[PDB]
Amino acid sequence: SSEDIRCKCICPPYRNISGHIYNQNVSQKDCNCLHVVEPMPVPGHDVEAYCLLCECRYEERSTTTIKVIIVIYLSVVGALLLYMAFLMLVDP
Amino acid sequence: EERSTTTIKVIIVIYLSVVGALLLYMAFLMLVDP
Amino acid sequence: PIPGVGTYDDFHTIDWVREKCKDRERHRRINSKKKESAWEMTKSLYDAWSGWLVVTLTGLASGALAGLIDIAADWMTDLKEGICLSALWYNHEQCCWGSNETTFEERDKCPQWKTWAELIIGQAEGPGSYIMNYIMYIFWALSFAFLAVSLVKVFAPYACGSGIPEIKTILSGFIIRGYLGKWTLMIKTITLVLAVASGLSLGKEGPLVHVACCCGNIFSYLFPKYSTNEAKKREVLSAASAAGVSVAFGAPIGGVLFSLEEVSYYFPLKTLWRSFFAALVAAFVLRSINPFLVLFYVEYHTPWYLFELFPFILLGVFGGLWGAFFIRANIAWCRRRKSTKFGKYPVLEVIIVAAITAVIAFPNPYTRLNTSELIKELFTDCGPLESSSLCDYRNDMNGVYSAIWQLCLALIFKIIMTVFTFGIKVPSGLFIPSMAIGAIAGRIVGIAVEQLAYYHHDWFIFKEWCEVGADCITPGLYAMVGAAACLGGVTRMTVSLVVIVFELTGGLEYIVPLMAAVMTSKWVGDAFGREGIYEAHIRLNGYPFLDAKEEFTHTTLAADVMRPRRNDPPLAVLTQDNMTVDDIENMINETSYNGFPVIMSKESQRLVGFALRRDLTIAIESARKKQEGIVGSSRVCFAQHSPRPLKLRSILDMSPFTVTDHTPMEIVVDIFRKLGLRQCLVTHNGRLLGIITKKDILRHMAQTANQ
Amino acid sequence: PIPGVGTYDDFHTIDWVREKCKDRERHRRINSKKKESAWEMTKSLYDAWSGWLVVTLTGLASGALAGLIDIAADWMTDLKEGICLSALWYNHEQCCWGSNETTFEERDKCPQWKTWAELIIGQAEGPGSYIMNYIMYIFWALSFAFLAVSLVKVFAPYACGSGIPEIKTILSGFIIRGYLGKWTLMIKTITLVLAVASGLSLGKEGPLVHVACCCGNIFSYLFPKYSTNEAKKREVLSAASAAGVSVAFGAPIGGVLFSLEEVSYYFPLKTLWRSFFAALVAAFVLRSINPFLVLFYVEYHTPWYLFELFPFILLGVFGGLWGAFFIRANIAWCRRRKSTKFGKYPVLEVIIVAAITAVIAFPNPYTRLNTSELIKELFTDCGPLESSSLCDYRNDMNGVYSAIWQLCLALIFKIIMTVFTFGIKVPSGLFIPSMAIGAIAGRIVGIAVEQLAYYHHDWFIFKEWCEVGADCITPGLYAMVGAAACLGGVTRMTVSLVVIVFELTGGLEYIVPLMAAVMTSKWVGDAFGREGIYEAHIRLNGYPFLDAKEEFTHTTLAADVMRPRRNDPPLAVLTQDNMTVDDIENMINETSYNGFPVIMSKESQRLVGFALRRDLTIAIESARKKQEGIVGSSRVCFAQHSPRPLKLRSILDMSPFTVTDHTPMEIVVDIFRKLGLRQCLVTHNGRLLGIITKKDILRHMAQTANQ
Numbered sequence A: 001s002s003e004d005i006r007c008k009c010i011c012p013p014y015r016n017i018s019g020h021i022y023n024q025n026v027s028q029k030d031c032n033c034l035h036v037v038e039p040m041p042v043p044g045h046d047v048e049a050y051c052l053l054c055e056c057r058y059e060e061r062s063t064t065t066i067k068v069i070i071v072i073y074l075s076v077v078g079a080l081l082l083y084m085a086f087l088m089l090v091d092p
Numbered sequence B: 001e002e003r004s005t006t007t008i009k010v011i012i013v014i015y016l017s018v019v020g021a022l023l024l025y026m027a028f029l030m031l032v033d034p
Numbered sequence C, D: 001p002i003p004g005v006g007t008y009d010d011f012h013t014i015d016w017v018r019e020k021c022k023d024r025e026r027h028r029r030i031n032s033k034k035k036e037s038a039w040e041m042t043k044s045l046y047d048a049w050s051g052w053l054v055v056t057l058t059g060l061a062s063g064a065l066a067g068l069i070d071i072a073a074d075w076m077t078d079l080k081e082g083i084c085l086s087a088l089w090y091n092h093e094q095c096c097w098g099s100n101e102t103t104f105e106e107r108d109k110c111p112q113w114k115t116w117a118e119l120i121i122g123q124a125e126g127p128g129s130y131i132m133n134y135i136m137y138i139f140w141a142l143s144f145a146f147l148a149v150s151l152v153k154v155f156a157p158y159a160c161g162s163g164i165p166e167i168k169t170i171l172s173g174f175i176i177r178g179y180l181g182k183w184t185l186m187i188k189t190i191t192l193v194l195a196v197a198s199g200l201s202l203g204k205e206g207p208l209v210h211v212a213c214c215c216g217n218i219f220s221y222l223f224p225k226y227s228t229n230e231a232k233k234r235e236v237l238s239a240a241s242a243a244g245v246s247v248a249f250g251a252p253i254g255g256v257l258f259s260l261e262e263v264s265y266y267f268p269l270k271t272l273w274r275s276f277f278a279a280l281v282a283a284f285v286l287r288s289i290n291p292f293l294v295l296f297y298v299e300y301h302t303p304w305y306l307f308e309l310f311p312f313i314l315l316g317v318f319g320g321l322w323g324a325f326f327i328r329a330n331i332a333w334c335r336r337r338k339s340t341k342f343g344k345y346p347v348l349e350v351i352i353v354a355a356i357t358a359v360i361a362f363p364n365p366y367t368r369l370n371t372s373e374l375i376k377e378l379f380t381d382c383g384p385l386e387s388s389s390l391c392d393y394r395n396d397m398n399g400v401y402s403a404i405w406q407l408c409l410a411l412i413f414k415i416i417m418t419v420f421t422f423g424i425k426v427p428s429g430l431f432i433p434s435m436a437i438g439a440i441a442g443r444i445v446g447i448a449v450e451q452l453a454y455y456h457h458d459w460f461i462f463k464e465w466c467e468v469g470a471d472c473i474t475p476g477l478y479a480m481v482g483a484a485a486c487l488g489g490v491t492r493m494t495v496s497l498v499v500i501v502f503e504l505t506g507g508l509e510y511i512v513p514l515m516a517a518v519m520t521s522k523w524v525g526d527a528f529g530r531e532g533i534y535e536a537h538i539r540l541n542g543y544p545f546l547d548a549k550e551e552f553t554h555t556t557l558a559a560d561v562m563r564p565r566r567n568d569p570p571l572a573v574l575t576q577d578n579m580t581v582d583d584i585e586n587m588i589n590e591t592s593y594n595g596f597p598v599i600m601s602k603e604s605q606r607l608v609g610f611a612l613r614r615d616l617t618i619a620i621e622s623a624r625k626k627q628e629g630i631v632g633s634s635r636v637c638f639a640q641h642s643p644r645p646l647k648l649r650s651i652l653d654m655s656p657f658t659v660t661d662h663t664p665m666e667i668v669v670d671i672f673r674k675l676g677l678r679q680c681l682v683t684h685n686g687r688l689l690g691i692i693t694k695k696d697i698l699r700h701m702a703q704t705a706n707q
């Protein structure tokens, strides 16, 4: 899934231009500053130095795991509270 | 890469000196001590 | 034997020698029956693997529960700041996980996430929006705290607290029925998330040990070997605590070290590998679920220098100076809770403490941030890529005063709040608060050292160790050292703590500085008292816990601790023969003794053995039901084989432990600690003179400490 | 008391209870005098810091000695290949380090270093050059072996062997005077380097533990507390062993685990932190000297996959199968050395073994290479920069058969040689040989798995786990797993071994595979026998060692193991009063009993106390010297206060341990193990019937095992 996968390049400030984050969804090999950064604020001859100062990473998240964990925790909490209400009111 | 010449200096020299002293003491015990 | 014989009452210690004999007898029976049939061989194989199976189950359950708790706590903690309408299941980071509207200035800024002000006010910025965010933060914290405390009170009272003190007492031999039950497990699992989200000065890492122990206790019922024997169950619980620490900090080696050092009174060699395996399994599960390999990974490019030991040692001292204080403060507060009426209103206390915490934390950024997140922020090394506020001054010159002042305010807030937060009737942990306090202190110290180095590079130490105009000082390392120092000062753990910190950081280059800081903190804390926070809580609760540190005076003798003494009447004894069932039942009802010494004759006073009161009554009732005519008139004969007398020799212990009156009490205490004896019969001239009980030793030690 | 009271004979087990009581008495005495004077306060402060000072000194000495031994061994090993004429004092790597003639094919190819063929023959290459190098290698190996064995025999016979078995026996209370002396330390330090230079199938990592223990003993002589008390000395020795393992593998945590699990019979909580500190100090010293942070650092880019566990488990099986075999083989060979006359010639045996080792090692490059160097090369992962022969096949296609054949030949040679090299009269370690055997096996298995993946990527497992045409399989990880498996199988270490391997390679990502392989090897070895190599050697040498694994039959009772029994005469007893000094001296001379019980009256047989024979004779002689008229006629009164009778109550134990005849021997063994009893007294009806001794317990267990 697109939401599960992404890749970001963080560029610290370089000469006039300030720090900038470029986050796009791409495969691991497609995760590169030149592909992730389009266009480059710095000039062409300094684009390579900007890339060197730039640190890029490719990340994957199991959003479905968070889905299930949150859902089951909420269900358990709701059931426990419903049982507490049962004990406090209905049980008498 | 960097290395310490003096560490090898001391370790090798003192080990050889101790070994030689032990061998000399062994010879003394085998022959001189009798 | 009679059903129910050998069982232990609640709030009673187990006799480890008797449990070992029971385990040996069961092993003999199982091994003997192997050749009888193939099914017996399969049962024996299952018994042999019972330990491996139970540790595997405990590790799997601990990992799953830790991952679920971590994710739920993150989501619910971020619920206070706002909601993600596009996804009511993403926290702030997840909702900005892939947004393209994010900015270098703000990593967690996306249109998808929406703060409560923009939900209700519709404006993200403005005094009204800030007031609304403040109010909603307080309201959510209060609701989470109320829910947690209500669940703890309604269903599982034991779920409150870290549980490490009670785990210690149980592993010593103490019994608390329901502490490690399913109800407590579930309630604590929910309430840990609730409390962590409430924003109170507490953590979930320590309570994970109790959660794992509950899982292990529940799984022990599946395997008869560990369900029948209490010592085997306690070994499984030690492995469970190791796995719990592993999931808490991702430190299986550190988990095993903690299990040996702190909670486990007895650690058989086999339990070492079993605990390590359980911890590894739990950590593997956690890595499988929770990520979506180091939680607090740090990257200090410059190696730590020798002179930096002096600041670290200072941090160490601070740790101890804090630790002792907390131990003297929290306990006192806790004592007041047991003495005055404010302890009669647990829910109200939790609500008030949560309200105070939220109110004073929201204005300050560091306090508002989650404690674990604050620790991570403090640990990280400042760099050009980073945009953390703490490093802003470094960017500006290379405001420092503003960041330092905010850090000190957060430190004071956390230090004062941890005293009241710990001990309330919700699952609370001290590890995370101690880490945060120490990390803030270490960050302040490291910032000061870096400023001294940069401003004054003419100093020979700074110039020689660090190049001029170079960021040799890494404040993250100082924060880590301070966290370790504070945790060592409060807990007094030495090697397990160092290994846990190293695993949580993933860096073996800082193990020497961490060890030095922990040593200094422990020494400073011991200067003000050698008892840790968990041990102090054990003593405050009055549990029957005996520690190797405690010892008797040289003058003390076994005669002094003998139960009969002078004022007390002679201890009850049971005649070997010519004594009716009615007489035994009347003696059982009259006295609350754990067990009675059985003597051959009243005049002889020659000890034949020791018969437990529980075993005596259970055997009498079972024999009455089994055999007719036992109306209490029939005599009871404890000697080896119309009246049809009841035989109670089996329940009686043939070789009770015996010591002489002239024996020093130090030897008696040493024997009790090493062998886990429930009681020892003091005999003079080969005749019974009295009984010393672990309860008697604990009472004498308590009076000596109270004087 | 009388001087010399409380001391022990050579080859005698100590009484831990008595030593603890002595330590407590000394602590009371020193504490009492603190208020007397300021100098007393300074003495008490020094005593309190005695443990820290002694462990620091032991760690520093162990680190320095380990570094010296490592560099000296490296230089001597490279001496065999040739000599650096420009610097007689350098090894091959050092001599060719700065050479600009180095080539990619040969990294250590420099003009400065000259092989013996160049020295004498004058041609580096040619059949004559190869023959000359072969002869010189054999001659140097034999010379080093002769020097090592001669030095061991002449000065320190104890220097031979790893010392782990004897250290285990000592830490259990056994006494071997001179084992940890200065002579042993020096001779073992020299002979370890000599033996490693000889090229024998042995290692210096394990014996460094004995070196550290010797240093710890020598330093303990400085501090009065540790010199006076044997139990405190053994705690210091446990810390020393931890430091020794730390220097051996650079694994302070692994060293602490090894000390806790393998060599330390009793491990107090304080000793844990003290041992960790000593290990850290020793590791720091080694890092400060030896380099010129991980010895076996490994860089496997591809993370280990779940299917990769199956080969690892397979390696584990091999690790067991070899291990047990070695335990069955080496022991037998060692036993033959004791039974036959080939053990009567230690120097000749060492020389022949070294000759065979060198002769068969020179033809094969892996065998000729130092065992530690071979392990390093095996662990390293193949890469384009690497020019190793092992990786040549990978470069050719992506001769594998030739490389695998050479590795298998080296494996067989090492397996055969380790059997005949362990136990000879030179310092030998099994750690490095086991590591090399397992590493070779793992390298072969990993090469096979990589070939399967590359040739048969169509397989669903390989295709899913590994991309087609990708080097997912990493042979270095297989080599590490195999080394860990072999070491676990031979030693049966589970947690300490895994942590040691992790520290030695610095890889926390491979902890799970290492643990799986170690557990598999441990279980496979236990299938053929639970006793490890160290415990097996302890049993072979017949030391008085008691282990928790050993247990008695349920039928056995305290009466069975009683010393008097039936055939033997009644155990000698001393009357409380009316006994002459001559009678006590005659009893001492007549019997070899460690101690004599003293009863109030011969007819009564009522135990009054227990006086050690050594203490009895020492007290009698000292009183004779001190007080005139003690010609043996004067009576001796053991009861509490013209003849001027000698008073021997002080040496007497007022509360000796006592058990009943009907007590099962399982409880007696448990008491002996937990409390470290030297002896207990079996009493019936309040009178002394017999005496059980630790020696009798070991005799009975040995008889049961031998049946």
Ligand SMILES: CC(C)CCC[C@@H](C)[C@H]1CC[C@H]2[C@@H]3CC=C4C[C@@H](O)CC[C@]4(C)[C@H]3CC[C@]12C
Residues within 6 Å of the ligand: A074, A077, C079, C083, C085, C088, C144, C147
């Ligand atoms: C105690 C814990 C377990 C309860 C957690 C329940 C939370 C997540 C619930 C309680 C109230 C809920 C909100 C109530 C109303 C709305 C308005 C609707 O247009 C969008 C969803 C939104 C904004 C809900 C989001 C989820 C919410 C915040």
Ligand SMILES: CC(C)CCC[C@@H](C)[C@H]1CC[C@H]2[C@@H]3CC=C4C[C@@H](O)CC[C@]4(C)[C@H]3CC[C@]12C
Residues within 6 Å of the ligand: C056, C057, C058, C060, C061, C064, C285, C288, C289
């Ligand atoms: C009786 C008790 C001990 C059983 C507990 C079983 C637990 C540990 C099981 C049940 C479901 C399992 C998960 C199911 C699916 C996945 C996705 C996979 O890509 C990684 C493993 C992971 C994340 C599993 C981890 C372990 C897990 C959580």
Ligand SMILES: CC(C)CCC[C@@H](C)[C@H]1CC[C@H]2[C@@H]3CC=C4C[C@@H](O)CC[C@]4(C)[C@H]3CC[C@]12C
Residues within 6 Å of the ligand: D056, D057, D058, D060, D061, D063, D064, D285, D288, D289
């Ligand atoms: C009584 C015993 C314990 C004393 C032992 C002291 C030993 C450990 C001391 C003596 C000399 C010392 C060395 C002296 C000089 C250097 C160079 C320095 O750049 C790093 C430390 C190093 C390498 C020291 C390491 C520790 C050392 C080897």
Ligand SMILES: CC(C)CCC[C@@H](C)[C@H]1CC[C@H]2[C@@H]3CC=C4C[C@@H](O)CC[C@]4(C)[C@H]3CC[C@]12C
Residues within 6 Å of the ligand: B016, B019, D079, D083, D088, D119, D144, D147
């Ligand atoms: C047992 C151990 C400690 C002894 C070590 C001594 C070694 C280093 C000695 C013994 C014989 C020595 C060699 C003897 C003769 C020569 C020829 C000379 O023109 C150059 C040095 C050279 C080549 C020596 C090198 C060093 C040497 C190899």
Ligand SMILES: [Cl-]
Residues within 6 Å of the ligand: C202, C203, C204, C205, C206, C207, C428, C429, C430, C431, C432, C433
């Ligand atoms: Cl916590």
Ligand SMILES: [Cl-]
Residues within 6 Å of the ligand: C162, C164, C205, C206, C207, C428, C429, C430, C431
């Ligand atoms: Cl906690």
Ligand SMILES: [Cl-]
Residues within 6 Å of the ligand: D202, D203, D204, D205, D206, D207, D428, D429, D430, D431, D432, D433
């Ligand atoms: Cl070795």
Ligand SMILES: [Cl-]
Residues within 6 Å of the ligand: D162, D164, D205, D206, D207, D428, D429, D430, D431
């Ligand atoms: Cl060894």
